[PDB]
Amino acid sequence: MNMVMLTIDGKQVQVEKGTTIKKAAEKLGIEIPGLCDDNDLKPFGACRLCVVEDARGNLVASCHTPVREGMVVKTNSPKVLKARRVILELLLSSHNADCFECDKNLHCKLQKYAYELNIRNIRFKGEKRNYEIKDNGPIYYDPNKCILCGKCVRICEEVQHICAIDFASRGFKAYISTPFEKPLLESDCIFCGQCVRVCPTGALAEKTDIERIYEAISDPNKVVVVQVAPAVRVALGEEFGLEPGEIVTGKMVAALKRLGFDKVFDTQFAADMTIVEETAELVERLEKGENFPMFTSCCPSWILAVEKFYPELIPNISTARSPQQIFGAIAKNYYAKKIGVARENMFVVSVMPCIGKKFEATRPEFNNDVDAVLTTRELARMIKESGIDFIKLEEENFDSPLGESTGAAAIFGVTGGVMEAALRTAYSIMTGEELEGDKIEFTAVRGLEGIKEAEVDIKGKKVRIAIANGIGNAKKLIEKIKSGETKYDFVEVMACPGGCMSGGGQPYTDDPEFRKKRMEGIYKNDRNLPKRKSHENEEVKKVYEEYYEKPCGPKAHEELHTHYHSRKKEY
Amino acid sequence: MNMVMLTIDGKQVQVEKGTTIKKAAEKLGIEIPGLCDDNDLKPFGACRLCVVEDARGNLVASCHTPVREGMVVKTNSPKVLKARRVILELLLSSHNADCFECDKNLHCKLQKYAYELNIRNIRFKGEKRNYEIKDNGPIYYDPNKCILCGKCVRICEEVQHICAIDFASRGFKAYISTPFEKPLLESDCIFCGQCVRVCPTGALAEKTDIERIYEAISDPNKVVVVQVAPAVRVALGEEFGLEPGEIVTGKMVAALKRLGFDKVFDTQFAADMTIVEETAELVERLEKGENFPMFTSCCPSWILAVEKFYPELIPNISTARSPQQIFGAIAKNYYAKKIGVARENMFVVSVMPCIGKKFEATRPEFNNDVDAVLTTRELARMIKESGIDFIKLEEENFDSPLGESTGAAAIFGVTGGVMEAALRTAYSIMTGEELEGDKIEFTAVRGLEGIKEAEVDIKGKKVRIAIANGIGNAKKLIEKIKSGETKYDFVEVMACPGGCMSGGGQPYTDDPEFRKKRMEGIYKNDRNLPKRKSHENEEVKKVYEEYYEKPCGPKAHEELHTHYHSRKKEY
Ligand code: HC1
Ligand code: HC1
Ligand code: SF4
Ligand code: SF4
Ligand code: SF4
Ligand code: SF4
Ligand code: SF4
Ligand code: SF4
Ligand code: SF4
Ligand code: SF4
Ligand code: FES
Ligand code: FES
Numbered sequence A, B: 001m002n003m004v005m006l007t008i009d010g011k012q013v014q015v016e017k018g019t020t021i022k023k024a025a026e027k028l029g030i031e032i033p034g035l036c037d038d039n040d041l042k043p044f045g046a047c048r049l050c051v052v053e054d055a056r057g058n059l060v061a062s063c064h065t066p067v068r069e070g071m072v073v074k075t076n077s078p079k080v081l082k083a084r085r086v087i088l089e090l091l092l093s094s095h096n097a098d099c100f101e102c103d104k105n106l107h108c109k110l111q112k113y114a115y116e117l118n119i120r121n122i123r124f125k126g127e128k129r130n131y132e133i134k135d136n137g138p139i140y141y142d143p144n145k146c147i148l149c150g151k152c153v154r155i156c157e158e159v160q161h162i163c164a165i166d167f168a169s170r171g172f173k174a175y176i177s178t179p180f181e182k183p184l185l186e187s188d189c190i191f192c193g194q195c196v197r198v199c200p201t202g203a204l205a206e207k208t209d210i211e212r213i214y215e216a217i218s219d220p221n222k223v224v225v226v227q228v229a230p231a232v233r234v235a236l237g238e239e240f241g242l243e244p245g246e247i248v249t250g251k252m253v254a255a256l257k258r259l260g261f262d263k264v265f266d267t268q269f270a271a272d273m274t275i276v277e278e279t280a281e282l283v284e285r286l287e288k289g290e291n292f293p294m295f296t297s298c299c300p301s302w303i304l305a306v307e308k309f310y311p312e313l314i315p316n317i318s319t320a321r322s323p324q325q326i327f328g329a330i331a332k333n334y335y336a337k338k339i340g341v342a343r344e345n346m347f348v349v350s351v352m353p354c355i356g357k358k359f360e361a362t363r364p365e366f367n368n369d370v371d372a373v374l375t376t377r378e379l380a381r382m383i384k385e386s387g388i389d390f391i392k393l394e395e396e397n398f399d400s401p402l403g404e405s406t407g408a409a410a411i412f413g414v415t416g417g418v419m420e421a422a423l424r425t426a427y428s429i430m431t432g433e434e435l436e437g438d439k440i441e442f443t444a445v446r447g448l449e450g451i452k453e454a455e456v457d458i459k460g461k462k463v464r465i466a467i468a469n470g471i472g473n474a475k476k477l478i479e480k481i482k483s484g485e486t487k488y489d490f491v492e493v494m495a496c497p498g499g500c501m502s503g504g505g506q507p508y509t510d511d512p513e514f515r516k517k518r519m520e521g522i523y524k525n526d527r528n529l530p531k532r533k534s535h536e537n538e539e540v541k542k543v544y545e546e547y548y549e550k551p552c553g554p555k556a557h558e559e560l561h562t563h564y565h566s567r568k569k570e571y
Helices: A021-028 A078-092 A109-116 A151-159 A194-198 A210-217 A249-258 A268-288 A300-309 A311-316 A323-339 A356-360 A376-386 A417-431 A471-482 A514-527 A538-548 A554-559 B021-028 B078-092 B109-116 B151-159 B194-198 B210-217 B236-240 B249-258 B268-288 B300-309 B311-316 B323-339 B356-360 B376-386 B417-431 B471-482 B514-527 B538-548 B554-559
Strands: A003-008 A011-016 A051-054 A059-061 A071-074 A139-141 A166-168 A175-177 A204-206 A223-228 A263-266 A346-351 A372-374 A451-458 A461-469 A490-494 B003-008 B011-016 B051-054 B059-061 B072-074 B139-141 B166-168 B175-177 B204-206 B223-228 B263-266 B346-351 B372-374 B451-458 B461-469 B490-494
Touching (some): A003 A021, A051 A078, A078 A109, A109 B376, A151 A194, A194 A204, A210 A372, A210 A376, A210 B078, A223 A323, A249 A376, A268 A323, A268 A417, A300 A311, A300 A356, A300 A471, A323 A346, A323 A356, A376 B109, A417 A451, A417 A461, B003 B021, B078 B109, B151 B194, B194 B204, B210 B376, B249 B376, B268 B323, B268 B538, B300 B311, B300 B471, B417 B451, B471 B490, B538 B554
Parallel strands (some): A223 A263, A346 A372, A461 A490, B003 B072, B223 B346, B346 B372, B461 B490
Antiparallel strands (some): A003 A011, A051 A071, A166 A175, B139 B204, B166 B175, B451 B461
16 A cells, blocks of 8 residues: 555545556546446557546546656646547447437437537538348347447456457458357357446347237236346336335335236245255255255356356256246246136236346247246336336235245345355254344355355254356356365356346446445345245245145156256357 | 316326316326426427327327316326327437437437337338528527427417517428518517427527637636626536535535636626615616606616617616626726736636526627626536536635625525615615614515515605516506506516526426425525625725725716617518
8 A cells, every 4th residue: 555646637636556547536526538448347448538638748548547656637628628529529420320219318328428528510421330230139239339349348258258259340340249140049148148238338238028018918818917036126216216225115016016917926935935946955965965066047147158168067957947937837837727817818027137037038948938028127118108106106015825925035136145045944954943043144155255165064064065156256166166176065156246136137327336235235125024034934835735745746846847958069 | 176086097086176187197196298288388289199098998188188077097008108109209200310419418308208108110211301500699499300399489479478489381391480580689589588498309499609618718818707697506406416496606616616717706796786886876866756667677688678669668777787797897897907917818708597698798889898608507518528526526615806795696596686685775875774683684575476566665755666577577567557557666677487597598497396496595595694785795895995986986887887779670
C-alpha cells in the first residue's frame, strides 16, 4: 500500500500504485464514458471513447493507463468532447436503426451515450452494414447492430474457458462468428448465456415465446399453470425502480394472478422433492461405495459440458431430473388426474432466470413436459404491457396443494445452497436426530470463492466435499481429481460464476456490487421461513404416500430419472 | 354526491356519477395507455389507443365514456392487446426514425409505448411522411415526427385563447400549420411555450445554443459569467431522479463551477433592483394619480400580447426592464469597469425556464446585453455530458459581489410573488415602519385561482390590486377593466398558468400534482432565508451609492428603462 500524487481537474487525489486513471478519477465523482471495458475483463482499448488530455497535450486512453507521480489530467476540455462526438458520429453513421423494433430499447448503452453526448445531426452518410440473420436456437444474433467491442469473445475465452466464438474477416467487414457460420448447437457452445449478459447493444438477444402463451390463454379448452424460480423473487423488483435483493414474492404472485394464469405454484416444492431423491441416492451410493465422486445434475449447461468435453464422467452423474422437469411431470401426471383434466389440455409455463432451460425444455427425452419457458425480463415486459402497477400491489399467497415450501429450498439461487440443503437432509438421514440452533448453517461452504472445500464430520464419519462455481473452476477441479491428488464423495458444479443469481435471464444492472446484494437478499429470505429442512415438508409426504410410495421406486425411477448420452462429434 | 357501482376486471368499484372509465379504473392501480389526452384538456378521441371491451363484445374508448350502473369492463383481453399492437404498428409504419438524432430521445412517449406493448417487426412497409423543416425562431418544428394528436392546437385554443395554429389539409397529408406557412414571428404567436410543453413526440422542440457557449469558453481572451433563475433550483433535481420541489441550489452552483464558468451569480439581485425601481415608480404614479392602472413588464410574452392585440395599454405599462436584462446591463456596464475588462471581451449566459426569454434576448433595443440563453433541460444535458454526478456533490455558495440575495426575490417563480414583494417594499416606503411577525405574508394573494383580487389597507389608504395568471384570465380582466365596472391601481399578468414554474423550459413530468409540489418548495425556500425584504439588501445600496446615486435617476433612466412599440400589422 504505497500512495501516489496526481492532479485531476485541479483536485489532489490519493491512490495506490497501479490504479488506472479511470479508477482514480472515480473517487472524485467523475464518470468517464466507455463501451469496451467491464468489471470482469481486462482493458481492451477498442472504443477509444475514454480519452483524456494530459499536460503535454495528447489524447490518452484512461482505461489502461497506469498512474504516475506529478501527473496533470484534464477530462472535460473541448478537444476531448469534440473527439468523442466525432467517434460516436462515426459509429452511428453505419448503424441499422430500428430502435422501434429493438429488444434492447430503453436499455441500450449506445442510445444513452448518443443522448448524453449531444448528437443531433450526422454528417457522414453512406455505406452501412448489411448481413443475414439466422436462428441460433435460444440466442438471437443480429450482426447489423454490432459495434465490435469484443466483450462476448473476451468473456467466453478469459472467464468461461470454452472459446466457442472469435473474430472473423478484417477491416470494415469484420464480424463475430463460429467456424464456418455453423449453428451454435453443434459448435462448442454450452448455452450458459454470459455473452448475452454483457453485450452493450441489441446484437445479442433472446428468443421470445410470449405469443404462444397468449394464444394458449385465449384458448377456452386449456388450463394454464405457472411455476416461479427461487431467484426471480429477488431481482424482479429491480425492473420497477427498487434496489437489488428486495423481496417481491407477494407482489409478483398478485401480478401473475392478474395476468390471467389460472394456478400459480413455485418450484421449491420440486426442489425439496429433488433434495429427497438426491439424498437417498447419495446415501445408497455411500453404502455401496462405487462410482465416486458423484456430481449434481441441476445445471443444464454443466450437463452439456459433460456430454461434449468430458464424456467419461457420465456414469458418475446423478440421474435425478432438474426441479423444472420434475414439477412438469408432477403437474401433468398427478395433478391433472386429481383435478380431472386430460393430459393434452394442460399448459405449463415456467419463469426462469436461465438460458439453458430454454434449450433443456425441448429435449426429446422429456416427452414435452414443459410447453414454454420465460425469463425475468420477459415477465417484467408482460407486467408493464398489461398495465399493472407494481409498487402499490397487495400481497397474496401461492395456490394449493403444490405451493407450500420450506427454507432449505429457498437457497438454490446462490452457490453452495444445494450442498447445504443436501447436508442438512443427509445428517438427519444418517444419524436420526435433527440439527438445532446455529448448527443448521454450514458457514464453511458460503462465499464467492473459486473452489470451496470442506470436511463435515457426521458422528465420526468424515466426507470429502467440494463446490466449484464456474466452468473454468470446474475444469480445474476435474484436472485435480483425475490426476489422483485426492478423492471426494460429492461435488457441485454451476456454470455461472456466483450461482443462478448471475444468470443470463436476469435484469441488467450497473452497480458493481449486485452479487453481494442478491446473496444477502437470498440469505435473508431463507432466514425468515418457519421450516428449514426438506423432510419437514408436508405435501411431499402426501405425494409419496399416494402415488410413488417410496423414493427411488419403480414408478419414481420411471418418471423422476433420466439418462445421458455422449455428444462428442469426433472429427 | 351520488355513487355508481360497476365491475372492472372482476373488482367492484364505487365512483361518482360522470367519471369516465379511465378515471374509475385508475383507483384500482390500472394504467390504460393513451396519447391524445391530457389533464388540462377535454377528451378528443384521436389515438384510439385506450379501447376496452365491454360485456357486449365491442371496443369502446375509455377516455370519453361515462360510467353506468351494472357495467362489465375487460381491460387486458387478447383482442384489445392485438388492436393496440396493430394501431401502433400503423403509426410506426410512417415515422422518420432518427432516434439517435432526436432531441426527445429517452423522453418520448411513442418510444416508451413501442417498447412496452412489445413491437419487434413491422409488417407494413411503404410510403412515409416527407416534409421540409423551416426555422420558426426559438421553436423547432419537424412535421415528419407528428402523430396528429391535436394537443398543441387544443392547448392554444381552449386554454390560452390565442388560436395561432390549426389543422391544414386532410387525410394522410394532414399537418399543423400557420396561415400560409408563415413564420411564427409575424403570426399571432406570443412565444409562451405551452405547446412545446405538452407535445408527446419530438416534433416540437426548442433551439439550442450550446455550441456557441462551448466555442466562447475555449476562447482564451474572454470571461464568461452565468446567472440562474429563481425557479431553476426547485425543478433541476427532477432530471436526476429526485422529487419535485427539492432544493438543489448548492449542488447546481458546484456543478456550474465544475462546468468551466468563471463566475456564477444569481438573478435575485436584479430582482431586488427591479423591485426597488418598480416600487418607486408606483409610489410616484400614485402621488401623481395618472395613467391607471399600472401593469408589470417582467413577462416577455405579456409584452408581446400587449404589442400585438392591445396596443392602447402601452402608456400604462411599467418601463422597468426585466431582471435578466437589468443583470446583463449591470454586468457589462459596472462589473467590467471594476474588474478591468473591455465590454467586447465579456460573455453573459443565462439559465431560464422560459421560451420567451430566447426571443427577448435578441431584441434590437437591448444592444445585445445577453449573449446566450439556456434552459433547465439544456443545463441538465450539459451536466450529464460532462460526467458530474449530481447526488454526491458538495454544497457551495455564489460568487461576489453580486451573489447575495434576500427572501423577497425568491418567490418570483410562482404566481403572486411579485405583488407580495412589491407590497412588502411599498408598505415600508409609504409608512416608514417595518412589518414584523406573520404580517409579512399576504395570504389573500396566494393560491392557484384564475383571477385573484385583494384589498390591502396601508395606514388608512386602500389600494386595489389584481393578479391574473394566464392569457385567458388576462383578457377577461382587460374586458372587465375597459368597461368601467371597477378601477384598480396595480395589476400583475403572467402568460403561463401557475407562474414561471410551469414554463416551457422546465423538465417533463408525469405526476398530476407538480404545481402544488413546486409551489410548496418555492415557499419553503423563501421561508428559510435571513432577510425577507428588498430594501434590506446590502449590495443594492452600494450600487446606488457608487454608480446611479438615486432610483429613477438620469443614468438609471438611461440604462434601466425601455420603451415599447406597436406590432399590430394591419391587414
Ligand atoms: O432446475 C432447476 Fe434450479 O441448483 C437449478 O439449478 S435453482 Fe431454479 O433459483 C429454476 O427454475 C434457477 O435459476 S429451480 C434452476 O435453474
Ligand atoms: O426576467 C425575469 Fe423573471 O416575475 C420573470 O418573470 S422570475 Fe425568472 O423564476 C428568470 O430568469 C423566471 O422564470 S427572473 C423570469 O422569467
Ligand atoms: S453462451 Fe456461453 S459458451 Fe456459448 S458463446 Fe456465450 S459465453 Fe460462450
Ligand atoms: S456481439 Fe455484443 S458483446 Fe460481442 S462484440 Fe458484438 S457488441 Fe460486443
Ligand atoms: S442496439 Fe441500441 S442504438 Fe442500435 S437499434 Fe438497438 S437500441 Fe437502438
Ligand atoms: S448456474 Fe443456474 S443460471 Fe447458470 S446455467 Fe446453470 S442453471 Fe442456468
Ligand atoms: S407558443 Fe403559445 S401562442 Fe404560440 S403556438 Fe404555442 S401555445 Fe400558441
Ligand atoms: S405538433 Fe405535437 S402536440 Fe401538435 S399535433 Fe403534432 S404531436 Fe400533437
Ligand atoms: S419522436 Fe420519439 S419515436 Fe420519433 S424519432 Fe423522436 S424519440 Fe424516436
Ligand atoms: S410566466 Fe414566466 S415562464 Fe411563462 S412566459 Fe412569462 S416569463 Fe416565461
Ligand atoms: S473503455 Fe477505454 S478504450 Fe474502451
Ligand atoms: S386517450 Fe382515449 S382516444 Fe386517445
